Design a binder for these strands. Structure first.
Ligand SMILES: O=C(NC1(C(=O)O)CCCC1)c1ccc(-c2ccc(NC(=O)c3nc(-c4ccccc4)oc3C(F)(F)F)cc2)cc1
Ligand SMILES: O=C(NC1(C(=O)O)CCCC1)c1ccc(-c2ccc(NC(=O)c3nc(-c4ccccc4)oc3C(F)(F)F)cc2)cc1
Ligand SMILES: O=C(NC1(C(=O)O)CCCC1)c1ccc(-c2ccc(NC(=O)c3nc(-c4ccccc4)oc3C(F)(F)F)cc2)cc1
Lengths: 585, 593, 593
RNA sequence: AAAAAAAAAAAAAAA
């Protein structure tokens, strides 16, 4: 809709029945005209933000990864007050801004074509905010829209939404007041594939009032309820994607990429063919070696031997042969899993690594615990203080104080490396937040337990799924310190490997798609797998959920099976945790 | 004067008649003897500071620019107080220190010979400060003197001064009490050329009491008054330069530089000759397109073809080819302007770009505005709060609190680039301060309007003179929020192109300097021009002023014409702004009372 | 002892007679199993910490030094409370953490084989702390143990201990309450060589109550008392080293280094041989030049000549020839000192450089002073304020407030360099701490002098031992401000060069080892010397001491002589600076009352 | 981390 000369606008409607209806408006052609693409987004003519996308002129090939940057700028005048810091100006980004950056980055990063090396930056500035609303999902939609309008090698629009479960109804774009009446809150992002919605990213939690609401007659959030919520999110995502596509079509764009960006593939076809022909049997034999150290040294000497010949023939190109060896090893591992259902460490597909839990490991600490799963080792420590030591928060969001604080540390020596020790990175902030929200729903009220609580997790050894280990360790340490939890909580990380491998028959035209679900995946299995998701909760319902995928469709039965498998593992871990301690000390 | 063996001293006198006399003393040969040059500067026996200059042993020829760095270190013991921070120690530099660094850097940077690639650093430490005095101009003088004594490829001494207009007299080096009785105060820096003072840098503002003083019978600071003030600062600059030169002569130095520094020109002469002979006609034709996208595409194609062919011929030397192409383009643009009075975008020499102004653009904002000039686009937002949210200042200078705050932001996408988004840089601080001082003299008193005020400017699009756009946007947004200003304010930027071109005749000896003044310059005209002169004010008098120039002298009539043209442009912009809003609105329901 | 499958532990006992006995326990095989080495250390089953050591897979040859890194992580839950900062989380390291990092780094860094280029990182995390205990020395032991256990090219275990002098007994690992009754406190680190303890690192101070304790009848800490304290620490170090070695043997390791680390020597044998054969006599004569400027000019001429001669022959290698020339020049200077007792500047073995002291240099400062020793030049400034301006400290240690603060600044221009100016480095923190502790024992009580005191030292020129110069300047400036000190304090830096050379005779296999002690060493002498130590105090006893060495044994007579020589120099300097001021002045009118 | 050796329009990961 051309409201003005050069200005275009589109609208999408979210109908929540008796809970109301909301409108989202996208506008382009008026602000920030020197960027590659720019969009202004409105929610209910009271929430307003701007998103701009640009790209660098020259490729940059000293890097070996795709350089993408996302930034969120929260302006205090959007809340109508002056910043409280000593210099009266906005400083480093807050935790909410970092979490929003991660939410945008996770689904968009894999949507670009492989091998790109130009810098790409997305900046989202918050301009106006209603006190009872949340801006993160709106920001996701705006970032997608500006990237789409920028004429870059980007795979279609991406839509994001939040759904909350209130009195048996899934409500889209709920307010803070409505969230206070819900039992479960979930952010979902996806895209449209051949007329159907494919889920890409999920982040969900249980609310802080869930136990009381369930005692009043509400339905608890079990696995089937979560699946139903995922199904209910799809129509909203479809509507948002349609609005973005209409905006792109109206303001030209569509085709005519004009500027063409080069691509830098990891390796050439001939190098890969030679590497396969020379090392297929060596790698196949090596992967059958039980143990860790001997297998690692066998693989290392295979690498040094193979690179000693092909590099000389291919005129001093060792990175290409290394990449080809990585690709061949990954393919072999996937094929072995798909055919024999045999994992690299020898486990079955439903097996968990060796578990152990212990309490009272730091002499003067108020509470402490040590939790081990395979080579993953987490130490948790809890301290208690007067209620005045709760954190005071000054930001755009509605939160003003923080009674329970959780901090997560990941030192380089946990993986045998060296590196800078200093401020936490974005990934540490994200992992800490996930564990914190996993624990929030099981906590006594201020009236019955008037203390400020700080929990610290330190990853002393890491081989995959450190967040779930921190969840378990925090439950153990809180019990050891005498906090009266409503119920213990545990978590697990699951993986999925899918492929269209041949089935019983011939002709090679009867291939059917197959899926395999893996319990308690290692780091390598995450790197080589097709989907990974983490589940935490009690023995009655889920408290936290996180999922990332890139497949173009997942049958419902596969997801139901995966959720049930995760629940079984969670119960098995809860039994071992209870053996160490089963009531507050 | 050798007061002690190896120690030399020189003095300069500033005579203000019935307002008093002041003395400035330079000393060398006693402190910091391992630096390349070092000087101690005194003002009235009570203000004392130290300046030191050093240079790196080896060059960095892979750099594309001259790496000069300036640092100002404020010590709290200069005021007899312990720092108030949690660790009781000086931390990151304050806004005053950053502004002083910019003041030193602007005139000194062009004074070095081009092509230099050694690192040069200047550090100024404040040792003792009288509560009623300012140290910035003294610092400019000391930095110049230490660099002059360091035996570097530096062009002559530079002198800097402050002048304030009190009862029709321009007083040099005024105190805080004297400044609060003035209507205008201005900092000027220059050098001596063929026995006359050439002005290089200017920074001026009207005071916060100007309206009340003018109502009481004082003369308002119009254009002619400001020009007279510029003329009155020259004798002081000459005296300061003479004192510095005498100090340099006394302590040896002067000749025999001893250390020789290499130079790295951007391109060779043969490369320039080839580029010219291959591309002159193509470039001349391309500049006639005058339609941006087509012109940009044509220039890019010409550049690609030339670099390809000349890299084939010269075996992979592309940087010099690019530099030569840029220099040739600059020469053609300047010649077109000087001969035919044609600009890049097809404007006359006095024309302003298309203007537009709008208010109430952010829904839950106390006031907001959008201001556009051709391709520069500024968004301004106002917020109001209780008087206790005023900024508390704990610096070395006399200021203790700030009722009105202005912050300026310049994101990378404003010009289509990618870069880091973080803490503001020094240039952002400078632009913000310039826009802030243009509005102070018009704000209402705290008794009438008891609120703290914060203004934010965001440069959504940048193609030249973003600070003047910030001034206009702040006026609009403040009016939209219900602040009762005394008068609206607006601003503009001006440019210059000059050279020695033979007048109609012969003998090649009648060559004389010729000047052309441009209104509302583009970014490219600033890059290829000879100066950048920003003027802001009301319809009655000027409120803020900033100038930097690289030439060796501008005739007074040229500046007078520039000021008059700027005033005409300002009036046009004010009329356009008033058409959009001409009186304060009602206060927003979301604001406090 | 294998308490559990794969878990080993060992114990060391420390017996203080009637003052009690303590135990230190080392454990491995349980925590942090992916690091190269990891150890847990316990003190009295109430203090607990963890240390981990890792190494990078590949070397890096573009560095010209050994990249070792040490980090100390203080966790606030070890004290059982939530951090007090706005974000409720631990931020940048505190001063105590930095000092502990340097205490670990000083003895361990020279203990690795030269030429190593892999990254080595050590991280020590504090897990549990008793309120009346100190964790720094326990951390030193743990870092040594984890490095030893990692199978790296590391020369044997290193032990560290603290001894405090109480009622004539040297107590090991004292508590805070016990230190409150001591006159002297000393941290010592060493290692076992051919069955005897060789001292490597010392850092010592006098307590804040020393004057009153000595008035009460205790013995003052003179030079002989400090020597006795150094002797009393050896058995504890031996026991700690033995426990570490037993732990290493029990858990395998010992042999089988497995991982081989390449080494990158500075120069080859042939390059050194040619450089010597072509430059021996040419450099020998240049060192006889008494003029520093002529000396360095000739030296750089010779370097350029040798470089341009030998670059062609060795296919171009400037770094190797430069390194060989450095080794040759250092060897020649050492031989000259050992044989003729001559120094670079022609001084005698006990001579001090020219001294000068002056007060009242900054006009408005409460007190100020300028101190010069040869080419070293320090400016000191004092500030006084209300007692509420004392620093408030929030950390693990028992300290909670800081009445006297000392800050030390080392700008790049003090050596004629360019560099970043801003937050201080670790070395500045260390030097400031040393000067602060040197002054603490001479200070009036709060009841007698109710003020907060801030002292700032600025190194305007540096050529060697700026920290002792800071001590002298602080005494002068404090007297000038009117602070009633109990006695003045001065300091000096000393060097020692040792070697085994032939004695008058024949056979050439009867060489004997000799030592030469140097007073007030230059920077070059420190670079080319074998040991350096700094001593400060009054005319009656020592207040601070710092020592670093790598020799495998020092006779007691040599050390006694060195201490006496330092005392003589200190008395001479005190006499010189009493001429400038001998009693406190009247308080400045600008200071509060 | 060891050591004396800013000017201009031009973050992802176990690694
Ligand atoms: O700990 C973690 N924690 C995190 C968590 O989730 O919380 C913390 C925050 C996020 C992660 C983590 C730990 C380890 C990994 C990992 C991934 C891949 C490989 N890669 C191989 O391991 C390999 N490389 C080869 C090969 C190499 C060269 C030539 C030929 C082959 O072969 C192989 C072979 F199959 F043998 F196993 C190792 C480790 C990831 C995550
Ligand atoms: O806003 C601005 N600054 C600030 C302000 O507020 O003021 C904002 C924040 C602080 C200050 C600003 C914006 C843009 C510019 C700019 C300048 C020059 C060019 N350069 C060409 O534009 C060009 N380059 C060529 C050429 C190049 C190589 C080879 C051959 C030809 O030709 C040409 C041709 F003349 F055509 F136009 C572009 C943009 C400057 C300032
Ligand atoms: O100021 C200081 N302050 C500090 C303090 O302690 O507080 C502050 C914090 C720690 C230090 C300091 C000042 C100077 C040094 C230093 C060290 C070595 C050399 N090096 C030569 O000095 C030399 N180099 C040559 C030569 C070179 C190349 C080719 C051939 C010859 O010859 C020679 C010859 F020995 F003769 F004198 C110079 C200065 C150290 C510290």
């Amino acid at each position: 809709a051309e409201i003005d000369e050069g200005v275009f606008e589109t609208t999408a409607t979210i109908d929540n029945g008796s809970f109301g209806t909301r409108t989202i408006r996208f506008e382009t052609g008026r602000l920030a005209l020197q960027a590659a693409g720019a969009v202004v987004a409105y929610l209910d003519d009271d929430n307003m933000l701007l998103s701009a996308t640009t790209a660098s002129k020259n490729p940059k090939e000293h890097f070996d990864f795709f350089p993408l940057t996302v930034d969120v700028e929260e302006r205090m005048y959007a809340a109508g007050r002056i910043p409280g810091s000593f210099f009266r100006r906005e400083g480093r980004p807050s935790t909410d801004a970092i979490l929003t950056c991660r939410l945008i980055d996770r689904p968009l990063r894999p949507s670009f074509v492989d091998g790109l090396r130009n810098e790409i930056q997305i900046v989202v500035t918050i301009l106006s905010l209603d006190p009872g609303d949340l801006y993160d999902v709106l920001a996701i939609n705006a970032a997608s829209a500006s990237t789409q309008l920028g004429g870059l090698p980007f795979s279609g629009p991406i839509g994001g939404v939040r759904v909350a479960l209130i009195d048996g109804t899934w409500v889209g774009f709920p307010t803070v007041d409505q969230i206070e009446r819900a039992v479960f809150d979930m952010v979902v992002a996806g895209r449209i594939v051949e007329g159907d919605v494919a889920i890409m990213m999920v982040e969900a939690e249980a609310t802080e009032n869930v136990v009381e609401l369930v005692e009043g007659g509400a339905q608890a959030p079990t696995e089937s309820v979560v699946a139903a919520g995922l199904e209910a999110a799809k129509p909203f995502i479809a509507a948002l994607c349609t609005a973005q596509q209409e905006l792109a079509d109206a303001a030209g764009k569509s085709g005519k990429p004009t500027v063409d960006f080069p691509v830098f593939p990891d390796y050439g076809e001939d190098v890969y063919y030679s590497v396969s022909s020379v090392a297929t049997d060596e790698l196949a034999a090596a992967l059958t070696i039980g143990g860790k150290a001997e297998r690692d040294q066998r693989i290392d000497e295979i690498k040094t031997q193979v690179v000693q010949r092909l590099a000389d023939t291919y005129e001093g190109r060792e990175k290409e042969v290394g990449a080809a060896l990585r690709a061949l090893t990954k393919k072999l591992v996937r094929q072995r899993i798909l055919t024999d259902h045999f994992r690299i460490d020898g486990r079955g597909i439903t097996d968990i690594r060796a578990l152990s839990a212990e309490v009272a490991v730091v002499p003067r600490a108020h509470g402490s615990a040590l939790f081990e799963r395979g080579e993953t080792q987490i130490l948790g420590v809890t301290t208690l203080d007067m209620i005045k030591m709760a954190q005071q928060i000054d930001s755009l969001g509605p939160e003003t104080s923080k009674r329970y604080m959780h901090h997560y540390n990941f030192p380089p020596f946990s993986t045998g490396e060296t590196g800078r020790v200093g401020s936490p990175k974005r990934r540490e902030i994200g992992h800490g937040a996930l564990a914190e929200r996993a624990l929030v729903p099981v906590l006594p009220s201020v009236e019955e337990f008037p203390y400020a609580i700080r929990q610290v997790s330190e990853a002393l050894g890491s081989n995959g799924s450190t967040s779930m280990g921190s969840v378990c360790a925090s439950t153990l340490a809180l019990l050891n310190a005498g906090v009266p939890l409503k119920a213990p909580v545990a978590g697990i990380a699951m993986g999925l490997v899918s492929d269209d491998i041949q089935v019983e028959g011939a002709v090679d035209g009867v291939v059917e798609r197959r899926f395999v679900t893996l319990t308690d995946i290692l780091g390598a299995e995450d790197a080589f797998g097709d989907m990974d998701f983490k589940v935490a909760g009690t023995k009655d319902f889920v408290t936290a959920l996180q999922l990332d995928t890139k497949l173009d469709g997942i049958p419902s039965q596969v997801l139901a099976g995966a959720l049930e498998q995760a629940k079984d593992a969670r119960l098995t871990i809860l039994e071992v945790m209870a053996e160490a301690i089963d009531r507050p000390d």
